Amino acid sequence: MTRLDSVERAVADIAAGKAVIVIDDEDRENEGDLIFAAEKATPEMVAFMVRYTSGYLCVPLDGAICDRLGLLPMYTVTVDARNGIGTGISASDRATTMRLLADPTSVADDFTRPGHVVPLRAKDGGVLRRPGHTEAAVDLARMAGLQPAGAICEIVSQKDEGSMAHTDELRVFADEHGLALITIADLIEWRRKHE
Amino acid sequence: MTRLDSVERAVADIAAGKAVIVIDDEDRENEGDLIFAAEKATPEMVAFMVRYTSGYLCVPLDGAICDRLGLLPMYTVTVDARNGIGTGISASDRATTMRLLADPTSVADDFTRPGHVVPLRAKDGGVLRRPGHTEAAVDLARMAGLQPAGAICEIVSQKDEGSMAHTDELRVFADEHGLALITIADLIEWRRKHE
Ligand SMILES: [K+]
Ligand SMILES: [K+]
């Protein structure tokens, strides 16, 4: 019964530098990721994400970016921007790191390791190949015509503080903050229907 | 001029399962870590930490725990509890992982890797050997008579959302939440004065 937004809305929102929320399907016990495109990371957007999520910020990336950066060739890998930051943990610093990761001119030496941002390598083919939030993030940036790099983190429950938000609460959060809530099931369906 | 709390207060608070805040010294531009003892991790305490910090939760550990667990022998290392959790990211899940890390009966196989908690290896000798927040955390648990394992994360600025809180704001946060704010400088001084 939970209302779900459309893939068209999600894609336009991502293109506009907005965030969306992504869950697996209509199951009422799904956790959900706040997702935006990494090139659209600003201090304000990352602050919002850190405020409402676990803070364990990840950056899904196309394999080609990973390979370009000498990361995650086909222990957890972490990175910070080498330049333009302080300690690497602030919303403004992680936003810089995220934009750098999405920047096709960046190279391996533009990052210090270890760091405070967690890159993840998306499977080629996106959600049609692996129905993960990692793949959903990259697919959405690609569909919005952006560089194939996203930023993801899971939304904390405000009702049950020990927990992560489930589908009904995620619906409320999305409505309150003017955001789209979509499922990977629907994104798969859309991608199948439109080549 | 910023009022600082005493090492005696910090240690009693840690013993009582409370959190404290630790900065380097009286410099007004220091960032500060919220710190509690890992065995004192509860869903409520980790929820508080996640709410007000970067969410990039770390667990300073004595070398002996690290060695016992096959972690960080003398890429970033991450762990989750194998048992008793869901996805590993909730406040309740990370609290379980933290308690397990502090539990002297746990072994390597009690953890799955990778995970969502970041262990850090404290230098033997604590802040007298390396004046880090990692060392401060372990020293405080030891001084409180607890297992040498802590939980740390940096407090986000509520005044300037892109930033981390500095000394004056940290003073306000500590006062508002009934917490001690101490410096590593004073902890070093205390430890030197009392063998
Ligand atoms: K937070
Ligand atoms: K948070």
Question: How many whole angstroms separate alpha carbon A141 and alpha carbon B133?
Answer: 38
Q: A194 CB contacts (<8 Å, ≥6 apart)?
A: none
- Sheet of A180-183, strand order: A79-81, A111-121, A58-61, A150-154, A33-37, A20-23, A180-183
Contact B60, B137 (CB under 8 A): yes
Tokens representing A81 are 């921007």
User: Which three-class secondary structure state does DSSP give residue B64?
Assistant: helix
Question: A44 and B162 in contact (C-beta within 8 Å)?
Answer: yes
Method: X-ray
Q: What angle do CA B139, B142, B51 make, to 5 degrees?
A: 70
Which residue in A has a C-alpha nearest to residue B164's C-alpha? A90
A47 vs chain B: nearest CA distance in angstroms? Answer: 6
Q: Are A138 and A61 in contact (CB under 8 A)?
A: yes
How far apart (Å, rounded) are the C-alpha atoms in residues B109 and B88? Answer: 16
Of B47, B53, B113, Cβ closest to residue A162: B47
Answer positive or negative: Cα dihedral of A102, A107, A108, A111. Answer: negative
**What are the residues whose beta carbons fall under 8 Å from the beta carbon of A12, sequence distance 6 or more?**
A144
- Taking phi over 0 as left and psi of -120 to 50 as alpha, with beta for the rest, A125 belongs to left
Active site residue B194: no
Q: Summarize chain A as % helix, strand, coil (round to 5).
A: 40, 20, 40
Q: Which of A183, A182, A78 is nearest to A120 (CA)?
A: A78
Q: Name residue, tokens 């690497």.
A: A88
Active site residue B29: yes
Question: Residue B193: which H helix or E strand, with range?
Answer: helix B184-193
Pairing of strands B79-81, A180-183: unpaired
Residue B67's SS3 state is: helix
- A29 lies within 8 A of chain B by CB: no
Residue B101 vs residues B96, B119, B121, B150, B172: alpha-carbon distances, Å: 9, 9, 12, 9, 32
Alpha-helical regions (H) of A53-83:
63-68
Helix (H, G, I), strand (E, B) or coil at B53: strand
CB B36 within 8 A of CB B18: yes
| Tokens encoding B101 | 């890390």
A97 exposure class (CB count in 10 Å sphere: 0-12, 13-18, 19+): buried
Question: What are the tokens at B182?
Answer: 């101490």
**CATH architecture assigned to A1-195:** Alpha-Beta Complex (3.90)
Q: In whole angstroms, what is the distance from residue A124 CA to residue A119 CA?
A: 15
* B63-88 core/surface letters (b: 16 or more CB in 10 A; e: else): bebbeebebeeeebbbbbbbeebeeb
Residue whose C-alpha is closest to residue B167's, from B28, B1, B54: B28
- Which residues, at least 6 apart from B5, have a Cβ–Cβ distance to it below 8 Å? B20, B174, B180, B181, B182
**Per the omega criterion (within 30 degrees of 0), is the bond before B148 cis?**
no
Give the position of tokens 């993801």. A152
Cα separation, A22 vs A10, in Å, equals 9
Taking alpha carbons only, the member of B20, B47, B37 closest to residue B98 is B37
Contacts of B160 (CB under 8 A, 6+ apart): none
Distance between alpha carbon A141 and the CA centroid of its chain, in Å? 9
- Give the ligand whose atoms come closest to the C-alpha of residue B156: 1
Q: Report yes or no: B120 and B132 within 8 Å, Cβ to Cβ.
A: no
- Give the helix ranges, DSSP H, for chain A: 7-15, 43-52, 63-68, 91-102, 133-143, 167-177, 184-193
CB of A162 less than 8 A from some CB of B? yes
Residues in chain B: 195
Point out the residue among A46, A75, A153 whose CB comes nearest to the CB of B76: A75
> What are the tokens at A166?
């489930």
CB A100 within 8 A of CB A38: no
A103 is in an annotated binding site: no
Residue A154: alpha-carbon gap to chain centroid: 9
DSSP conformation class of B125: T
Residues 6 or more apart whose CB falls under 8 angstroms from that of A49 comprise A19, A34, A36, A57, A91, A151, A153
Yes or no: say if B108 and B67 are a contact pair by the CB < 8 Å rule.
no
Using the mean position of ligand 1's atoms as its centre, give its distance from the Cα of residue A93 in Å.
Answer: 15
